[PDB]
Amino acid sequence: TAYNEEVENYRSKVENARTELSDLLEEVKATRSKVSNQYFNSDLALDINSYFATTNQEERKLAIKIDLLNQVTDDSVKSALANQIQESLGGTLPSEYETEIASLMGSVDVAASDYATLFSKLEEMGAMTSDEVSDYQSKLALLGKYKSAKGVTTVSGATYSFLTAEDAKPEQSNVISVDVAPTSTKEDPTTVTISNVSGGTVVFADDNSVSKTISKAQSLKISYTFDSLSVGTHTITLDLNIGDNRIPMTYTIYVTDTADDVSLVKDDLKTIFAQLSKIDTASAMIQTLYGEPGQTDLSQIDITNPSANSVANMYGNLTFDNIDGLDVTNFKESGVTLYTELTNEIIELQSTIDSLP
Amino acid sequence: TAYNEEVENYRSKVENARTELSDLLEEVKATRSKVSNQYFNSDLALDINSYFATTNQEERKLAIKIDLLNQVTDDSVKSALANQIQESLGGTLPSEYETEIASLMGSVDVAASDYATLFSKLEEMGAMTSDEVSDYQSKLALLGKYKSAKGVTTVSGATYSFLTAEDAKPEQSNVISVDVAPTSTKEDPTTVTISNVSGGTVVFADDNSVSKTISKAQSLKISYTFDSLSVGTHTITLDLNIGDNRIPMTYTIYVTDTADDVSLVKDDLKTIFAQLSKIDTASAMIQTLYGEPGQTDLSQIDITNPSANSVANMYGNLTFDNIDGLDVTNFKESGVTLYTELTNEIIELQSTIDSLP
Ligand SMILES: [Cl-]
Ligand SMILES: [Cl-]
C-alpha cells in the first residue's frame, strides 16, 4: 500500500543513520584518546556516564573540567610537555673552549713536583709567599685532571740559571813583597815591624814574626789573612814601620751575595712570568667551565663527569626541571579544554543516537 | 488514524535528531579550529567539500593528509611548538660567577696607566718581555670594561721599593798621611817619590807633585783619585819610595749596580706575583663567560650586551633556533593526524545529516 510499500525505506534509512553515528562515535573516542596521550601522558578514558544526565551543556562542561583537574597531576603534564621537546633538551659545549685551553697547555708543564726546587728558591729569597706556592700547586693539580681527562699534549722540563748562580770567591790570604834598606860603612841595624793590625792577621811570611832587624838592602814578604770570608766588605789595616818611617797600609775584599738575585732578574724572571701566566689563565678557564658556580676549592672540580650546574653541563641546556611551571599550566589548560569539548561531543552524539527511533 | 495520528511524532523526532547533529557539527568545527591553532599556529579551516565525494574512508584520510602537508610549513609548526614553551626558553647565568670575579677584583687596580713605570723598569732589567706587557695591558683593559659594566669596587695605587733603590756611592778621591824621616848631625837630604801609578792619579796634596826631598821627620799627605766611578771594581796601585825603600800600595772601591735587583727580589716580587695572578685569573674568567667561544682578542668582548654564543647568554638557554628539527617534525605529525581525523569526522557527520529523511 503506502505504509509498508515505501515507508519501510524511511525506517531503514533512519536505522542506517543510527549505525553510521555509532561508528562515528568510536572514531571520536579514538581521537579523544590521542588527545589525552599528547597532553596528559596517559589515556584517562573519562567515563561519560556520570554527566549524561545533566542536560545543561555548560553545566556539563564545568562538571567535566572539574573532574579532569582533580585527576591529572601537574607532573604528568610536565612529562607530556617534555615528550614534545624530547630532542631539544640538552646542550652541547662548543669545542672551541677545549681547543683554546689545549693551545695554552701545549707550552706548560703540569707535573707539579718539577716545581719544588724553583718554588723553594723563590721562597728562600722572599720572592714568593707560602700561599702563592700552595695555590699554584692546586692550579697545577687541576691542569693535570684536565690533561688526563682529555688528551692534552704538554711540555716536560725546564732549567733556570739562577738556581746554580755563584758569586765570585775572593782569596782569603795573600802575600806581598817590599824592598827595605837600612838607614846609613856605618849602615847600622834597622828594625822593621808590623803594628796596629786589625781585620785579620799580618805577619812576615818566613818567620811568622812581626818584627825584623836588617843591615842591608833586602826584600821582605808579608802574609795577610782576612778574619773571614763572610758576606760583605772586609778590610785589613796595619802600619809598616821601617825605622822612623811609618807607612799605613790597607787591603779590602768584597764577598757579594747577589749572584742568584742578579741572575733571577735578568735571565729567568721573564720566563717565570710567562709560565705562571699560562698556568693562571688555563686553570681559571677550566675552573669556570667545570666548576659548580663560584667554586674555589679546585680539588673538588670533576672533568670527566661535569657537575649539574657547571657551564660544561648547562650551556644551551634546558633541563626537564627548569621547564617553567606556567608553561605546564597553560599546556594542562589546553589539553583540558580539548578533552572537555571532545567528551561533551561524545555525550551529545550518544544522546542523539539513543534518541532516534 | 495511524499514519498522521502517531506517525508525525516519528518524523518530528528524526528532524529533531537532524537539528541536534547540525549543532554538534559546529561544536566539532570549533574544536578542530583550536587543534589547528595549537599545532599549526593558525586556523587553516580546511574545506571539506573537496573530499566529500570520496567514499573510501582511508582514501579520504590520505587525501586530507597530503593536502595538509603541502599547506603547513615547518616554520609555522616551529612557532607553534615555541608557543608551548614560551617561558622556558632562555637561561639565567647564576650570580655566583660575578660574585667571585668581584671578590678577586676587590684587591686589584684596573687603571693600566698606573702600571707604566713598573712595566718600564721590569722591561729595562730584562725581567719581562714586550708582549707580556702588551697582554697585561689588554687584560687590564678588559677588567675595566667589566668594572664599568657592573659596579665593581677596586683598589687604587701601589708603591714599589725597587723603583727608587740606589747603590752606595763610594768616594772617588781620598787622602792619606805618612810619617817620613831622613836616613841618618849628618841627616842628609832624602827624596820621597810616587812611582808606577795606575788606576788614577796619585800626588802629594800640597804641591800636586810626585817627588819630595826632606831633611827632618815629617808627615806627608797623598791625594789619590780613581779614574772613574763607573760600575765595577776600581783599583789604584803605586810605589811609595822613601830613599832606597820601595813600599807598594793599593786602594780599591766597588761600584755596585745591584740595588734595584736586590730590592725587586726581596721586597716587591712577591707582591707583583700576587697582583699579576689576580689579573690573569679574573681576566680569564671574564673572557670565558663573555667572549664568543675561543675569542682571544679581548678588545672585542662586550659585557653589557653579551654576544649570542657567549656563556653569559647560553647558560641554560634553549633558543628558538636550536629547537630540534625532529621535534618540529613529530609535532607536525601529531597535529596532522588529529586534524585529519577531525576533518574526516566532520565529513561523516555531514554525510549522515544529509542522508537523513
Ligand atoms: Cl665543583
Ligand atoms: Cl667576542
XYZ file of C-alpha atoms and ligand atoms in Angstrom:
716
model
C 0.000 0.000 0.000
C 1.886 3.012 1.346
C 2.672 2.242 4.988
C 4.660 -0.923 4.182
C 5.302 -0.383 0.446
C 7.543 2.702 0.629
C 7.561 3.641 4.334
C 9.889 0.770 5.283
C 12.611 2.590 3.343
C 12.157 5.565 5.684
C 12.769 3.499 8.821
C 15.650 1.579 7.227
C 17.414 4.838 6.354
C 16.879 6.123 9.903
C 18.401 2.896 11.221
C 21.238 3.191 8.699
C 21.887 6.695 10.032
C 21.837 5.282 13.565
C 24.515 2.722 12.687
C 26.629 5.341 10.904
C 26.584 7.531 14.016
C 27.550 4.546 16.172
C 30.661 4.119 14.014
C 31.417 7.847 14.129
C 31.198 7.622 17.924
C 34.106 5.171 18.089
C 36.222 7.340 15.791
C 35.601 10.243 18.174
C 36.580 8.071 21.145
C 39.874 7.199 19.446
C 40.863 10.804 18.735
C 39.921 11.776 22.286
C 42.400 9.100 23.373
C 45.192 10.555 21.226
C 44.448 13.989 22.694
C 44.796 12.534 26.198
C 48.173 10.946 25.419
C 49.572 14.179 23.959
C 48.697 16.433 26.906
C 48.260 14.157 29.936
C 50.837 11.426 29.096
C 48.254 8.625 29.505
C 44.730 7.708 28.360
C 42.313 8.804 31.077
C 39.284 7.465 29.152
C 36.934 9.608 31.206
C 33.613 7.801 31.667
C 30.788 9.869 30.168
C 28.057 8.138 32.197
C 28.484 10.465 35.187
C 27.497 13.555 33.167
C 24.961 12.001 30.787
C 22.000 13.078 32.939
C 22.997 16.756 33.157
C 21.026 18.484 30.396
C 22.543 21.961 30.736
C 25.514 21.894 28.377
C 27.679 24.500 30.109
C 26.845 22.856 33.436
C 28.086 19.604 31.877
C 31.359 21.081 30.597
C 32.026 22.599 34.025
C 31.492 19.230 35.723
C 33.836 17.504 33.260
C 36.563 20.125 33.677
C 36.390 19.959 37.480
C 36.739 16.172 37.304
C 39.739 16.348 34.959
C 41.641 18.892 37.064
C 41.274 16.695 40.165
C 42.524 13.706 38.140
C 45.555 14.997 36.180
C 48.674 15.910 38.142
C 50.946 18.730 37.039
C 53.808 16.222 36.928
C 52.059 14.110 34.288
C 51.528 17.216 32.150
C 55.185 18.152 32.619
C 56.249 14.734 31.317
C 53.867 15.112 28.372
C 55.261 18.551 27.531
C 58.808 17.190 27.822
C 57.914 14.436 25.341
C 57.081 17.153 22.806
C 60.636 18.558 23.015
C 62.455 15.287 23.670
C 65.390 16.045 21.352
C 65.697 19.773 22.080
C 66.513 19.236 25.766
C 70.230 19.241 26.498
C 73.070 21.396 25.192
C 76.448 20.973 23.528
C 79.501 22.848 24.797
C 81.295 24.295 21.742
C 84.641 22.589 21.208
C 86.465 25.927 20.850
C 86.834 26.200 24.629
C 88.836 22.973 24.841
C 90.784 23.997 21.733
C 91.945 27.246 23.356
C 92.803 25.533 26.652
C 94.871 22.870 24.880
C 96.723 25.600 22.980
C 97.705 27.293 26.245
C 98.647 23.979 27.860
C 100.834 22.996 24.913
C 103.702 25.058 26.357
C 103.030 24.355 30.049
C 104.469 21.667 32.331
C 101.718 20.243 34.550
C 103.877 17.968 36.745
C 103.821 19.998 39.958
C 106.713 18.051 41.507
C 109.042 19.510 38.867
C 108.396 22.912 40.504
C 109.618 22.009 44.014
C 113.158 23.365 43.706
C 112.039 26.506 41.859
C 109.352 27.243 44.451
C 111.840 26.536 47.249
C 114.418 29.019 45.980
C 111.795 31.704 45.330
C 110.541 31.169 48.884
C 114.024 31.339 50.419
C 114.689 34.689 48.710
C 111.400 36.151 49.938
C 110.173 36.414 46.343
C 107.000 34.325 46.794
C 104.713 33.663 49.753
C 103.778 30.209 51.001
C 100.127 30.622 49.972
C 101.148 31.550 46.424
C 103.092 28.281 46.278
C 100.089 26.393 47.639
C 97.725 27.894 45.061
C 99.995 27.258 42.065
C 100.203 23.647 43.232
C 96.389 23.459 43.299
C 96.089 25.012 39.842
C 98.746 22.615 38.551
C 96.810 19.717 40.067
C 93.707 20.861 38.174
C 95.559 21.174 34.863
C 96.590 17.569 35.445
C 92.974 16.463 35.828
C 92.067 18.172 32.556
C 95.102 16.809 30.692
C 94.263 13.307 31.909
C 90.530 13.636 31.120
C 91.095 14.992 27.611
C 94.153 14.144 25.531
C 96.270 17.254 26.045
C 99.899 17.232 24.913
C 102.090 19.315 27.249
C 105.764 20.163 27.747
C 108.137 18.483 30.205
C 111.119 20.092 31.910
C 112.907 23.426 32.259
C 116.231 24.784 33.538
C 116.718 28.025 35.464
C 120.132 29.700 35.573
C 119.589 31.394 38.941
C 119.394 28.023 40.731
C 123.154 27.496 40.255
C 124.438 31.086 40.167
C 127.526 31.577 42.346
C 129.204 34.790 43.431
C 132.926 35.254 42.969
C 135.009 33.940 45.866
C 137.961 36.218 46.709
C 141.177 34.809 48.118
C 141.304 34.981 51.914
C 145.125 35.004 52.141
C 147.666 36.893 50.067
C 151.331 37.876 50.137
C 153.282 40.996 49.174
C 156.934 41.953 48.819
C 158.539 45.207 49.975
C 162.085 46.483 49.415
C 163.612 47.582 52.722
C 167.031 49.153 53.281
C 168.928 50.217 56.417
C 169.386 53.864 57.367
C 173.034 54.795 56.782
C 180.210 51.718 56.213
C 178.161 52.800 59.242
C 174.959 51.213 57.911
C 173.546 50.487 61.341
C 170.932 47.806 62.070
C 167.373 48.881 61.259
C 164.291 47.205 62.733
C 161.208 46.711 60.537
C 157.892 45.875 62.198
C 154.151 45.440 61.663
C 151.972 47.358 64.119
C 148.332 48.284 64.747
C 146.806 45.432 62.734
C 143.049 44.931 62.515
C 140.740 42.915 60.282
C 142.961 39.835 60.157
C 146.494 38.623 60.804
C 149.517 40.283 59.191
C 152.937 38.691 59.684
C 156.246 38.225 57.891
C 155.986 35.123 55.734
C 159.165 33.271 56.709
C 159.213 33.847 60.486
C 155.530 34.240 61.356
C 157.051 37.255 63.121
C 156.012 40.898 63.332
C 159.456 42.446 63.934
C 162.653 42.217 61.891
C 166.082 43.856 62.031
C 168.147 44.222 58.855
C 171.558 45.623 57.934
C 171.405 45.564 54.115
C 169.052 46.224 51.211
C 166.601 43.361 51.074
C 163.122 42.159 50.142
C 160.551 41.085 52.732
C 157.389 39.045 52.180
C 154.272 39.801 54.232
C 151.334 37.415 54.587
C 147.927 38.851 55.446
C 144.737 36.905 56.117
C 141.269 38.398 56.474
C 139.411 37.172 59.542
C 136.588 35.613 57.496
C 135.106 35.227 54.015
C 131.559 36.057 55.137
C 129.264 38.214 53.016
C 130.194 41.895 52.992
C 133.294 44.055 52.729
C 136.438 43.073 54.636
C 139.331 45.465 55.265
C 142.753 44.902 56.828
C 144.712 47.904 58.113
C 148.214 47.983 59.566
C 151.285 50.172 59.950
C 154.555 49.153 58.287
C 157.423 50.629 60.318
C 160.863 50.917 58.697
C 162.988 52.828 61.177
C 161.297 56.132 61.978
C 159.124 55.728 58.849
C 155.506 54.627 59.396
C 153.593 53.757 56.224
C 149.875 52.958 56.684
C 148.566 50.092 54.578
C 145.157 48.596 53.838
C 143.622 45.785 51.795
C 139.977 45.057 51.049
C 137.868 42.251 49.614
C 134.160 42.142 48.789
C 132.130 38.975 49.359
C 128.933 39.550 47.392
C 125.665 37.662 47.897
C 123.742 38.863 44.833
C 124.603 36.295 42.142
C 121.255 34.496 42.289
C 119.319 37.763 42.634
C 121.029 39.194 39.538
C 120.523 36.018 37.509
C 116.875 35.561 38.505
C 116.037 39.069 37.303
C 117.991 39.153 34.046
C 117.816 35.520 32.885
C 114.787 33.691 34.271
C 112.155 36.110 35.583
C 110.682 36.850 32.150
C 110.267 33.121 31.563
C 108.773 32.582 35.020
C 106.217 35.352 34.471
C 105.103 33.811 31.170
C 104.741 30.311 32.621
C 102.854 31.425 35.722
C 100.575 33.479 33.469
C 99.723 30.466 31.296
C 99.056 28.360 34.403
C 96.742 31.033 35.805
C 94.831 31.592 32.561
C 94.223 27.935 31.703
C 93.392 26.972 35.290
C 90.845 29.793 35.523
C 89.246 28.747 32.227
C 88.973 25.161 33.436
C 87.630 26.347 36.797
C 84.928 28.471 35.139
C 83.709 25.754 32.753
C 83.777 22.673 35.004
C 83.250 24.082 38.498
C 79.966 24.494 40.258
C 79.224 28.235 40.072
C 81.563 30.046 42.445
C 83.686 27.020 43.360
C 87.138 27.950 44.691
C 88.274 24.539 46.030
C 89.859 23.303 42.809
C 90.329 19.768 44.152
C 86.534 19.280 44.047
C 86.157 20.052 40.326
C 85.402 16.960 38.223
C 86.169 16.983 34.488
C 85.098 13.625 33.031
C 81.665 13.882 34.726
C 80.817 17.603 34.980
C 78.598 18.702 37.851
C 74.949 19.550 37.246
C 75.321 23.352 37.421
C 78.693 23.558 35.659
C 78.924 25.617 32.490
C 80.048 22.450 30.704
C 76.695 20.860 31.534
C 74.360 23.892 31.299
C 75.480 25.509 28.029
C 72.402 25.698 25.791
C 70.723 23.146 28.066
C 67.056 23.278 29.019
C 66.612 20.622 31.697
C 63.443 18.689 32.454
C 63.179 20.508 35.786
C 63.717 24.052 34.516
C 60.668 23.684 32.253
C 58.671 26.647 33.515
C 55.636 25.958 35.675
C 53.487 28.447 33.766
C 54.091 26.543 30.525
C 52.979 23.318 32.215
C 49.874 25.111 33.493
C 48.957 26.514 30.074
C 49.670 23.143 28.447
C 47.420 21.466 31.013
C 44.744 24.075 30.262
C 44.900 23.421 26.512
C 44.535 19.669 26.961
C 41.660 20.005 29.431
C 39.751 22.312 27.081
C 40.239 19.962 24.130
C 39.449 16.866 26.195
C 36.391 18.522 27.761
C 34.915 19.532 24.403
C 35.544 16.081 22.923
C 33.909 14.401 25.921
C 30.934 16.761 25.676
C 30.633 15.948 21.968
C 30.609 12.203 22.671
C 27.777 12.751 25.157
C 25.733 14.661 22.585
C 26.408 12.080 19.865
C 25.304 9.245 22.158
C 22.228 11.251 23.170
C 21.032 11.694 19.581
C 21.865 8.074 18.739
C 19.795 6.984 21.741
C 17.006 9.475 20.929
C 16.496 8.191 17.377
C 13.552 5.837 16.524
C -5.825 7.224 12.201
C -2.283 5.873 12.464
C -0.311 7.488 9.639
C -0.977 11.058 10.835
C -2.127 10.362 14.421
C 1.117 8.956 15.863
C 3.473 8.743 12.861
C 4.074 12.511 12.779
C 5.931 12.093 16.076
C 8.332 9.713 14.311
C 9.258 12.251 11.630
C 9.460 15.114 14.137
C 11.934 13.152 16.265
C 14.008 12.338 13.172
C 14.051 16.044 12.318
C 14.906 16.879 15.933
C 17.839 14.472 15.661
C 18.844 16.177 12.411
C 18.933 19.584 14.109
C 20.860 18.201 17.089
C 23.525 16.814 14.752
C 23.729 20.157 12.943
C 24.581 21.796 16.274
C 27.094 19.069 17.128
C 28.729 19.728 13.752
C 29.556 23.322 14.694
C 30.994 22.241 18.044
C 33.262 19.842 16.149
C 34.305 22.633 13.777
C 35.283 24.813 16.742
C 37.480 22.182 18.396
C 39.112 21.422 15.049
C 39.988 25.125 14.956
C 41.601 25.018 18.407
C 43.600 21.968 17.311
C 44.845 23.910 14.279
C 45.971 26.877 16.392
C 47.883 24.658 18.832
C 49.922 22.760 16.231
C 49.959 24.913 13.082
C 49.908 28.418 14.670
C 46.873 29.499 12.597
C 43.382 28.269 11.664
C 43.638 26.511 8.307
C 39.879 25.773 8.222
C 40.392 23.067 5.624
C 37.386 22.938 3.289
C 35.748 19.504 3.466
C 33.976 19.856 0.103
C 36.976 18.579 -1.871
C 36.881 15.157 -0.172
C 33.125 14.786 0.345
C 32.711 12.675 -2.807
C 35.417 10.131 -1.929
C 33.562 7.232 -0.301
C 36.585 5.145 0.704
C 37.427 6.378 4.192
C 41.145 5.573 4.202
C 41.384 7.035 0.699
C 39.777 10.174 2.150
C 42.168 10.432 5.108
C 45.136 10.026 2.756
C 43.871 12.844 0.525
C 43.366 15.133 3.533
C 46.823 14.405 4.948
C 48.524 15.039 1.597
C 46.716 18.379 1.341
C 47.709 19.425 4.869
C 51.401 18.593 4.420
C 51.563 20.728 1.259
C 49.866 23.580 3.151
C 51.652 23.763 6.538
C 55.270 24.912 6.572
C 57.751 23.547 9.083
C 58.380 27.124 10.227
C 54.749 27.589 11.274
C 54.919 24.373 13.305
C 58.173 25.552 14.883
C 56.487 28.779 16.000
C 53.555 26.775 17.371
C 55.881 24.475 19.315
C 57.780 27.502 20.636
C 54.490 28.975 21.879
C 54.049 25.869 24.036
C 57.345 26.561 25.856
C 57.239 30.356 25.708
C 58.504 30.883 29.270
C 61.012 28.018 29.376
C 63.148 29.458 26.564
C 66.093 31.492 27.806
C 68.523 30.950 30.672
C 69.810 32.800 33.718
C 73.533 33.000 34.456
C 73.994 32.242 38.179
C 75.160 35.330 40.050
C 77.974 33.412 41.782
C 80.266 33.953 38.790
C 80.087 37.738 39.118
C 80.409 37.409 42.899
C 83.711 35.526 42.598
C 85.071 37.918 39.959
C 84.235 40.958 42.096
C 85.981 39.329 45.061
C 89.176 38.915 43.034
C 88.921 42.439 41.622
C 88.449 43.947 45.076
C 92.229 43.919 45.602
C 93.250 44.729 42.013
C 93.999 48.087 40.379
C 92.468 48.201 36.892
C 93.884 51.570 35.756
C 96.509 50.326 33.304
C 98.281 53.701 33.136
C 99.326 53.275 36.776
C 101.462 50.329 35.580
C 103.601 52.260 33.065
C 106.603 52.907 35.311
C 106.528 49.400 36.805
C 106.349 47.786 33.364
C 109.109 50.099 32.120
C 111.546 49.151 34.874
C 110.793 45.433 34.524
C 111.429 45.779 30.787
C 114.700 47.677 31.253
C 116.040 44.939 33.556
C 115.134 42.194 31.085
C 112.618 40.785 33.572
C 109.564 40.968 31.276
C 109.119 40.794 27.508
C 107.307 43.408 25.446
C 104.476 41.010 24.556
C 103.885 40.214 28.231
C 103.465 43.949 28.828
C 101.088 44.191 25.874
C 98.935 41.307 27.114
C 98.676 42.558 30.705
C 97.535 45.884 29.262
C 94.828 44.076 27.263
C 93.692 42.084 30.296
C 93.643 45.278 32.359
C 91.560 46.947 29.652
C 89.054 44.086 29.884
C 88.839 44.274 33.680
C 87.978 47.931 33.148
C 85.091 47.047 30.839
C 83.707 44.636 33.433
C 84.168 47.070 36.333
C 82.384 49.768 34.338
C 79.572 47.436 33.188
C 78.907 46.049 36.668
C 79.543 48.028 39.842
C 82.879 46.588 40.944
C 84.815 48.312 43.724
C 88.583 48.054 43.153
C 91.818 49.320 44.701
C 93.824 52.341 43.540
C 97.580 52.794 43.830
C 100.721 50.968 44.941
C 104.368 51.744 45.728
C 107.351 49.565 44.829
C 110.640 49.942 46.705
C 112.829 48.752 43.825
C 111.845 51.761 41.686
C 113.939 54.081 43.896
C 116.644 51.712 45.165
C 120.132 53.233 44.933
C 123.503 51.565 45.344
C 126.091 53.033 47.675
C 128.305 55.663 46.051
C 131.954 55.405 47.163
C 134.159 58.473 47.360
C 136.239 58.976 44.217
C 139.012 60.972 45.943
C 140.712 60.381 49.274
C 143.795 61.464 51.202
C 146.282 59.702 53.479
C 149.130 60.734 55.760
C 152.508 59.005 56.079
C 155.345 59.683 58.530
C 158.630 60.057 56.649
C 162.094 60.592 58.128
C 165.532 61.162 56.572
C 168.216 58.477 56.553
C 170.932 59.493 59.023
C 174.025 65.713 62.633
C 174.684 64.207 59.193
C 170.977 63.678 58.477
C 171.340 64.083 54.737
C 168.506 65.096 52.393
C 166.190 62.223 51.464
C 163.925 62.262 48.407
C 160.432 60.744 48.655
C 158.535 59.984 45.450
C 155.448 58.330 43.963
C 156.164 55.963 41.073
C 154.436 53.395 38.856
C 150.892 54.695 39.366
C 147.920 53.135 37.592
C 144.155 53.293 38.027
C 144.035 57.016 38.774
C 146.180 59.966 39.808
C 148.325 59.888 42.953
C 150.117 63.075 44.003
C 151.270 64.907 47.118
C 148.401 67.051 48.349
C 150.133 70.406 48.828
C 152.358 70.526 45.724
C 150.447 68.420 43.197
C 153.948 66.943 42.920
C 155.222 63.371 42.778
C 158.711 63.946 44.230
C 159.784 65.482 47.537
C 163.079 65.901 49.389
C 163.106 66.175 53.185
C 165.734 66.622 55.894
C 163.683 66.007 59.061
C 160.938 63.786 60.455
C 157.688 64.905 58.903
C 154.187 63.970 57.768
C 153.148 63.939 54.108
C 149.624 63.933 52.680
C 148.885 61.996 49.485
C 145.790 62.536 47.344
C 144.605 59.694 45.125
C 141.722 59.782 42.656
C 140.272 56.784 40.842
C 139.887 57.323 37.109
C 136.098 56.858 37.197
C 133.126 55.880 39.358
C 131.660 53.516 36.752
C 130.125 50.187 37.738
C 132.664 47.568 38.790
C 135.800 47.316 40.900
C 138.425 50.064 40.701
C 141.985 49.648 41.983
C 144.848 52.134 42.282
C 148.405 50.820 42.631
C 151.601 52.791 43.162
C 155.056 52.600 44.711
C 155.960 54.896 47.610
C 159.729 55.452 47.545
C 161.450 56.744 50.694
C 165.155 56.618 49.941
C 166.098 53.085 48.919
C 162.814 51.818 50.431
C 160.011 50.954 47.982
C 156.644 50.207 49.591
C 153.884 49.025 47.213
C 150.436 50.434 47.909
C 146.928 49.812 46.600
C 143.383 51.069 47.139
C 140.107 49.678 45.835
C 136.472 50.726 45.568
C 133.432 48.770 44.395
C 130.671 50.470 42.405
C 127.767 48.028 42.566
C 124.778 48.001 40.208
C 122.531 45.524 42.037
C 120.448 47.717 44.365
C 117.270 47.519 42.286
C 117.794 43.820 41.523
C 118.169 43.027 45.236
C 115.155 45.126 46.222
C 112.890 43.773 43.475
C 113.524 40.202 44.616
C 113.288 40.644 48.383
C 110.702 43.432 48.726
C 108.351 43.614 45.746
C 108.438 40.416 43.681
C 106.080 38.504 45.979
C 103.566 41.336 45.699
C 103.984 41.546 41.923
C 103.374 37.807 41.534
C 100.148 38.019 43.549
C 98.811 41.000 41.595
C 99.636 39.560 38.180
C 97.991 36.305 39.270
C 94.751 38.066 40.231
C 94.754 39.969 36.928
C 95.240 36.736 34.984
C 92.578 34.778 36.874
C 89.832 37.407 36.738
C 90.556 38.338 33.120
C 90.370 34.680 32.078
C 87.067 34.226 33.921
C 85.626 37.288 32.204
C 86.996 36.109 28.851
C 85.392 32.668 29.234
C 81.943 33.956 30.238
C 81.523 36.929 27.883
C 83.640 36.006 24.859
C 82.461 34.229 21.777
C 83.792 30.668 22.138
C 87.540 30.720 21.568
C 87.902 34.507 21.389
C 91.443 35.717 22.129
C 91.135 39.381 21.035
C 89.977 40.748 24.383
C 89.144 44.172 22.932
C 86.209 42.601 21.044
C 84.482 41.185 24.142
C 81.302 43.072 25.079
C 79.974 42.877 28.648
C 76.760 44.924 28.836
C 75.364 43.189 25.711
C 76.833 39.658 25.640
C 77.305 38.024 22.252
C 74.912 35.326 21.068
C 77.228 32.347 21.688
C 78.788 33.651 24.911
C 78.425 31.552 28.041
C 76.667 34.525 29.639
C 73.936 34.253 27.008
C 73.771 30.455 26.502
C 73.746 29.174 30.097
C 70.589 27.076 30.488
C 69.244 28.702 27.317
C 67.250 26.837 24.687
C 66.909 29.253 21.777
C 64.091 29.354 19.246
C 66.521 28.198 16.557
C 68.094 25.300 18.451
C 64.655 23.682 18.793
C 65.440 20.348 17.172
C 64.063 19.686 13.705
C 62.906 16.186 14.634
C 60.713 17.603 17.406
C 59.119 20.000 14.914
C 58.537 17.079 12.543
C 56.915 14.898 15.210
C 54.847 17.854 16.436
C 53.705 18.494 12.865
C 52.826 14.797 12.564
C 50.715 14.852 15.734
C 48.743 17.889 14.593
C 48.163 16.495 11.100
C 46.858 13.204 12.498
C 44.499 14.981 14.895
C 43.383 17.494 12.265
C 42.907 14.757 9.652
C 40.724 12.626 11.927
C 38.630 15.629 12.973
C 38.129 16.656 9.343
C 37.168 13.091 8.421
C 34.679 13.050 11.303
C 33.074 16.296 10.118
C 32.642 14.749 6.665
C 30.926 11.688 8.124
C 28.693 13.792 10.382
C 27.608 15.957 7.441
C 27.024 12.831 5.345
C 24.625 11.288 7.869
C 22.905 14.636 8.448
C 22.411 14.941 4.686
C 21.362 11.276 4.362
C 18.562 11.547 6.933
C 14.874 11.871 5.822
Cl 82.833 21.557 41.955
Cl 83.776 38.446 21.319
